[PDB]
Amino acid sequence: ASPVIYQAEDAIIYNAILETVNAGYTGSCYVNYHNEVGGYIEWNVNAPSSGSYALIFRYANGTTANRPMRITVNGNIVKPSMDFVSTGAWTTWNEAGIVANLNQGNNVIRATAIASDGGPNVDYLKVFSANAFQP
Ligand SMILES: O=C(O)C1=C[C@H](O)[C@@H](O)[C@@H](O[C@@H]2[C@H](O)[C@@H](O)[C@@H](O)O[C@@H]2C(=O)O)O1
Ligand SMILES: [Ca+2]
């Protein structure tokens, strides 16, 4: 199966907004976190079969400082501190990814901002099967 893109507009967001300010996003918009601890973006992600999947965030970080996020799958912490390092400009969009085990059906995937400047700007979450890799 082709990778599935979970667009910004389809997320459940908390202390974050959907905006269009910085060029280079895809689809209708991207998420801009409030500049505070604890904002999050959450998607309901389908897994056709149980197994290992790549979860890739397309993101921008126009500050020099890492904007780490806590990644949970169904509330389970799979990455306590996932790095979202500077991309240099707010219009430069890079990828940051992890491999995680998902269950057949829905998986609740959340990225929560750890530090006080909030999370990176997030364009989408891209999900594809990565059975060759093992979390
Ligand atoms: O998260 C940010 O720090 C951030 C996200 C925006 O997408 C950027 O354009 C940039 O905006 C800042 C600031 O947060 C915003 O409130 C407004 O004052 O514009 C600023 C800017 O640098 O243009 O930063
Ligand atoms: Ca922000």
Best mutation site among 67, 90, 93 for ligand 1 pocket (most ligand atoms within 8 Å of CB): 90
Experimentally determined by = X-ray
Q: Where are the domains of the chain?
A: 1-135
Cα–Cα distances (Å) from 71 to 38, 40, 61, in that order, read 12, 10, 18
For the Cβ of 22 lying below 6 angstroms from any atom of ligand 1, the answer is yes
CATH-assigned architecture of domain 1-135 = Sandwich (2.60)
CA distance 21 to 27: 13
Q: Which protein residue has the closest C-alpha to ligand 1 atom 14?
A: 35
Q: Are 103 and 50 in contact (CB under 8 A)?
A: yes
Phi, psi torsion values for 64, nearest 5 degrees: -80, -20
Q: Which protein residue has the closest C-alpha to ligand 1 atom 24?
A: 62
CA torsion sign, 56 to 8 to 45 to 61? positive
Token pair listed for 89: 């400009």
Q: Are 68 and 57 in contact (CB under 8 A)?
A: no
Q: Exposure pattern of 62-92 as b/e (b: 16+ CB <10 Å)?
A: eeeebbbbbbbbeeeebbeebebebbeebee
CA distance 71 to 98: 9
Report DSSP letters for 62-111, one per residue. -SSS---EEEEETTEEEEEEE-----SSTT--EEEEEEEEE-SEEEEEEE
What 3-state class would DSSP assign to 129?
strand
Q: Are 28 and 49 in contact (CB under 8 A)?
A: no
Token pair listed for 17: 């907004």
